Write an enzyme that holds these catalytic residues in place. Structure first.
Site, PDB file in Angstrom:
ATOM      1  N   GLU A  93      -4.145  -0.294 -13.483  1.00  0.00           N
ATOM      2  CA  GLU A  93      -5.570  -0.609 -13.378  1.00  0.00           C
ATOM      3  C   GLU A  93      -6.430   0.145 -14.410  1.00  0.00           C
ATOM      4  O   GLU A  93      -7.519   0.655 -14.075  1.00  0.00           O
ATOM      5  CB  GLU A  93      -6.031  -0.269 -11.943  1.00  0.00           C
ATOM      6  CG  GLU A  93      -5.956   1.247 -11.585  1.00  0.00           C
ATOM      7  CD  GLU A  93      -4.648   1.700 -10.855  1.00  0.00           C
ATOM      8  OE1 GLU A  93      -3.599   1.074 -11.025  1.00  0.00           O
ATOM      9  OE2 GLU A  93      -4.680   2.720 -10.150  1.00  0.00           O
ATOM     10  N   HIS A  96      -5.052  -7.448  -7.113  1.00  0.00           N
ATOM     11  CA  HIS A  96      -4.790  -6.029  -6.825  1.00  0.00           C
ATOM     12  C   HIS A  96      -5.419  -5.132  -7.912  1.00  0.00           C
ATOM     13  O   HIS A  96      -6.138  -4.141  -7.626  1.00  0.00           O
ATOM     14  CB  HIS A  96      -3.280  -5.798  -6.761  1.00  0.00           C
ATOM     15  CG  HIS A  96      -2.882  -4.395  -6.379  1.00  0.00           C
ATOM     16  ND1 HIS A  96      -2.640  -4.016  -5.071  1.00  0.00           N
ATOM     17  CD2 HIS A  96      -2.662  -3.291  -7.136  1.00  0.00           C
ATOM     18  CE1 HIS A  96      -2.309  -2.735  -5.039  1.00  0.00           C
ATOM     19  NE2 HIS A  96      -2.312  -2.272  -6.275  1.00  0.00           N
ATOM     20  N   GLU A  97      -5.113  -5.433  -9.161  1.00  0.00           N
ATOM     21  CA  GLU A  97      -5.653  -4.599 -10.246  1.00  0.00           C
ATOM     22  C   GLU A  97      -7.181  -4.656 -10.299  1.00  0.00           C
ATOM     23  O   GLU A  97      -7.858  -3.642 -10.516  1.00  0.00           O
ATOM     24  CB  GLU A  97      -5.053  -5.049 -11.620  1.00  0.00           C
ATOM     25  CG  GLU A  97      -3.531  -4.955 -11.652  1.00  0.00           C
ATOM     26  CD  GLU A  97      -2.961  -3.564 -11.243  1.00  0.00           C
ATOM     27  OE1 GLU A  97      -3.608  -2.523 -11.488  1.00  0.00           O
ATOM     28  OE2 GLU A  97      -1.824  -3.525 -10.678  1.00  0.00           O
ATOM     29  N   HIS A 114      -8.728  -2.305  -7.708  1.00  0.00           N
ATOM     30  CA  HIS A 114      -8.717  -0.883  -8.134  1.00  0.00           C
ATOM     31  C   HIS A 114     -10.002  -0.461  -8.865  1.00  0.00           C
ATOM     32  O   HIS A 114     -10.270   0.729  -8.979  1.00  0.00           O
ATOM     33  CB  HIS A 114      -7.516  -0.588  -9.062  1.00  0.00           C
ATOM     34  CG  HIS A 114      -6.274  -0.156  -8.330  1.00  0.00           C
ATOM     35  ND1 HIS A 114      -6.272   0.856  -7.390  1.00  0.00           N
ATOM     36  CD2 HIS A 114      -4.987  -0.562  -8.449  1.00  0.00           C
ATOM     37  CE1 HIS A 114      -5.041   1.022  -6.930  1.00  0.00           C
ATOM     38  NE2 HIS A 114      -4.239   0.200  -7.584  1.00  0.00           N
ATOM     39  N   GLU A 166      -3.889   3.172  -2.907  1.00  0.00           N
ATOM     40  CA  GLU A 166      -3.046   1.954  -2.807  1.00  0.00           C
ATOM     41  C   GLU A 166      -3.296   1.121  -1.569  1.00  0.00           C
ATOM     42  O   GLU A 166      -3.372  -0.116  -1.638  1.00  0.00           O
ATOM     43  CB  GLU A 166      -1.553   2.334  -2.900  1.00  0.00           C
ATOM     44  CG  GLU A 166      -1.216   2.924  -4.288  1.00  0.00           C
ATOM     45  CD  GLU A 166      -1.781   2.008  -5.388  1.00  0.00           C
ATOM     46  OE1 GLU A 166      -1.848   0.748  -5.184  1.00  0.00           O
ATOM     47  OE2 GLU A 166      -2.172   2.522  -6.435  1.00  0.00           O
ATOM     48  N   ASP A 218       7.371  10.191  -9.678  1.00  0.00           N
ATOM     49  CA  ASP A 218       8.143   9.011 -10.080  1.00  0.00           C
ATOM     50  C   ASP A 218       9.372   8.766  -9.194  1.00  0.00           C
ATOM     51  O   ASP A 218       9.764   7.610  -8.983  1.00  0.00           O
ATOM     52  CB  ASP A 218       8.575   9.069 -11.562  1.00  0.00           C
ATOM     53  CG  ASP A 218       7.402   8.931 -12.518  1.00  0.00           C
ATOM     54  OD1 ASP A 218       6.412   8.267 -12.133  1.00  0.00           O
ATOM     55  OD2 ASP A 218       7.459   9.469 -13.648  1.00  0.00           O
ATOM     56  N   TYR A 228       1.519   1.783  -0.119  1.00  0.00           N
ATOM     57  CA  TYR A 228       0.928   0.440  -0.159  1.00  0.00           C
ATOM     58  C   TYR A 228       0.905  -0.204   1.209  1.00  0.00           C
ATOM     59  O   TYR A 228      -0.139  -0.678   1.643  1.00  0.00           O
ATOM     60  CB  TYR A 228       1.734  -0.509  -1.076  1.00  0.00           C
ATOM     61  CG  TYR A 228       1.701  -0.122  -2.533  1.00  0.00           C
ATOM     62  CD1 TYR A 228       2.554   0.871  -3.017  1.00  0.00           C
ATOM     63  CD2 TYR A 228       0.835  -0.748  -3.419  1.00  0.00           C
ATOM     64  CE1 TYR A 228       2.529   1.259  -4.345  1.00  0.00           C
ATOM     65  CE2 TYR A 228       0.815  -0.377  -4.798  1.00  0.00           C
ATOM     66  CZ  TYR A 228       1.679   0.643  -5.237  1.00  0.00           C
ATOM     67  OH  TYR A 228       1.716   1.059  -6.563  1.00  0.00           O
TER      68      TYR A 228
END
Ligand SMILES: c1ccn(CCOc2ccc3[nH]ccc3c2)c1
Ligand SMILES: [Yb+3]
Ligand SMILES: [Zn+2]
Length: 606
Positions: free
Chosen positions: A268, A292-293, A296, A315, A372, A380
């Site tokens: 985003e 979704h993006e 954000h 999220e 990561d 989410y």
């Protein structure tokens, strides 16, 4: 306390602005230049401070026109090395200075992927792209690499003149480079304060096409026409998001369609969302990723998680808004269908990690954990399930959307914790505190496993998917003849995907059933990446050797980790393809995205 950052925290000093002046060297795969940080002391008598770095070479540090002393500490694994800077004059509280650091990145920068011409569409020019979330901005430039600090920025980026640079910022002109006429300098301004993980850069042979009043799509020439069509709903989604979230404050909403090794469905970056080209289904069916993006732009970029332990705030709320946008476009029954699909993905993650695993908690503790490695569907979909549960508890979507808009207004331009959110929820719904006190907060927020309560879901669009999956699962050999292409007649691509998701939850199925499914439904012909992904997983888990080269191809020809990681893991788990799976990874790893290479290697134990 931001346990992912080695820099001085926001209570000690804070960066107000970054001016970045750099040059992208494709021959050396380095970015070289200066990062000028305007820093405000939050303490009396401040005489030093510490910045995050990772694999950076520091040439010098200049304050008030003089070089000053600095020291780089020992590397702390994925966190990098702390850089302590000796201030030449002690600062009083609120005093601001400018610190100019001359640096160069490493070719192995974990924020960056450098692509050769052969790895691009056009095959003539190289390409560079960044991805800073969560803690990779420190591998591009020294900074307080924590989302608890927000700063504006300006930048001047020198690149070979036949290429184009873009950033997460408004384009502020281009000129030839006075130091080198074979180069161009592109300039940028981000006037809205952002956390440094939102700093982004791409350099390549990019062209653009306008697709709405505030949106260009950018890609290599070969992908422009297809991307323009695929993402044509972008303006309509922005208008709905503005209705739910309040004013879009960022000026432009442009889209960048990356080469296939981009590791995520999207990122985003403000003014310039980055997306995977695996969205290019040809029919706009994966546009929830755009929704979704877009979302954000409020949840994440305006209201931001104070540390990465609170990533579900970013999220979960974003998935909640995403599903509302798509529900406005396509209906409340479709919103429920997508909501229920998400619960299914949460079941999968919890089963995969294990119902007591610390990464299945909503709020996680990332002390000594690489973000990561911890990354999953949990923030989410457990975050969304909490919000959907609260929506149902508190009187429905109209009421809960009132809370969401008030929450964005309240915390705009700020960084917050789960307690901040919960305090505001109680403040907003002060007349429903009796109902809020019925929630098992400790379980929802802090316990592993599935949530203590499942929301209620409309089943209308889901029933046909379950029905068909259950036919295949309970079928014996003498039932296989009854299946036929007509079975799929009335199913949308979303429904075909969910049919595969339901069936994959029960895999393996008998090999003969999977062969029949290809015979009657021809799933091998579907290019929809979500569909093809689940189909190939079902084939490999059900031990069909014919699917091996198909799965290897998909795993390597694109690099979205959502698809590449489970395909390699599946291929490793199948004894027939295991040796080829590790050989293929070994052969490709040097040319993979550095984070993807790291994670696939860990998944494969190589
Ligand atoms: C979507 C687009 C980029 N990324 C990068 C991964 O970032 C994070 C951030 C925050 C996180 N907290 C726990 C895992 C985790 C991972 C995820
Ligand atoms: Yb039978
Ligand atoms: Zn997101």
């Amino acid at each position: 306390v931001d346990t992912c950052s080695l820099a001085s925290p926001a209570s000690v000093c804070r960066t107000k602005h970054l001016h970045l002046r750099c040059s992208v060297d494709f021959t050396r795969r380095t970015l070289t230049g200066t990062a000028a940080l305007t820093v405000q002391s939050q303490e009396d008598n401040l005489r030093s401070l510490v910045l995050d770095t990772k694999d950076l070479t520091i040439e010098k540090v200049v304050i008030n026109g003089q070089e000053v002393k600095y020291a780089l500490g020992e590397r702390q694994s994925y966190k990098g090395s702390p850089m302590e800077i000796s201030l030449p004059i002690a600062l009083s509280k609120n005093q601001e200075i400018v610190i100019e650091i001359s640096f160069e990145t490493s070719p192995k920068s974990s924020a960056l992927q450098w692509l050769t011409p052969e790895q691009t569409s056009g095959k003539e020019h190289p390409y560079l792209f960044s991805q800073c979330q969560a803690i990779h901005c420190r591998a591009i430039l020294p900074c307080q690499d924590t989302p608890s600090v927000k700063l504006t920025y300006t930048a001047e980026v020198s690149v070979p003149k036949e290429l184009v640079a873009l950033m997460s910022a408004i384009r502020d002109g281009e000129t030839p480079d006075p130091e080198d006429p074979s180069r161009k300098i592109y300039k940028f301004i981000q006037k809205v304060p952002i956390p440094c993980y939102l700093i982004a850069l791409v350099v390549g042979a990019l062209e653009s096409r306008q697709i709405g009043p505030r949106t260009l799509v950018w890609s290599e020439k070969e992908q422009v026409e297809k991307s323009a069509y695929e993402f044509s709903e972008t303006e309509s989604m922005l208008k709905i998001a503005e209705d739910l979230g309040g004013p879009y404050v960022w000026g432009q909403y442009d889209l960048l369609v990356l080469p296939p090794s981009f590791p995520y469905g999207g990122m985003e970056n403000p003014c310039l969302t980055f997306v995977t080209p695996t969205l290019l289904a040809g029919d706009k069916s994966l546009s929830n990723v755009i929704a979704h993006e877009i979302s954000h732009s409020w949840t994440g970029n305006l209201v931001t998680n104070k540390t990465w332990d609170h990533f579900w705030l970013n999220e979960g709320h974003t998935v909640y808004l995403e599903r509302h946008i798509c529900g406005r476009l396509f209906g409340e029954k479709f919103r429920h269908f997508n909501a229920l699909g998400g619960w299914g993905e949460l079941q999968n993650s919890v089963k995969t990690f294990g119902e007591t695993h610390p990464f299945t908690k909503l709020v996680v503790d990332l002390t000594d954990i690489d973000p990561d490695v911890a990354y999953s569907s949990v923030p989410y979909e457990k975050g969304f399930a909490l919000l959907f549960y609260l929506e149902q508890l508190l009187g429905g979507p109209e009421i809960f959307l009132g809370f969401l808009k008030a929450y964005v207004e309240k915390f705009s331009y700020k960084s917050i914790t789960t307690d901040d959110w919960k305090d505001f929820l109680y403040s907003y719904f002060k007349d429903k505190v009796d109902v809020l006190n019925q929630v098992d907060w400790n379980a929802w927020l802090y316990s592993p496993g599935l949530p203590p309560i499942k929301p209620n879901y409309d089943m209308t669009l889901t029933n046909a998917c379950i029905a068909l999956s259950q036919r295949w699962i309970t079928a014996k050999e003498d039932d296989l003849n009854s299946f036929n292409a007509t079975d799929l007649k009335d199913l949308s691509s979303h429904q075909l995907n969910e049919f595969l998701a339901q069936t994959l939850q029960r895999a393996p199925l008998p090999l003969g059933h999977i062969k029949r499914m290809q015979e009657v439904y021809n799933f091998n012909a579907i290019n929809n990446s979500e569909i093809r992904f689940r189909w190939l997983r079902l084939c490999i888990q059900s031990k069909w050797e014919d699917a091996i080269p198909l799965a290897l191809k998909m795993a390597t020809e694109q690099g979205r980790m959502k698809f590449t990681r489970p395909l390699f893991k599946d291929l490793a788990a199948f004894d027939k393809s295991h040796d080829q799976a590790v050989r293929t990874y070994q052969e490709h790893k040097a040319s993979m995205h550095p984070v993807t290479a790291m994670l696939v290697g860990k998944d494969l134990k190589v």
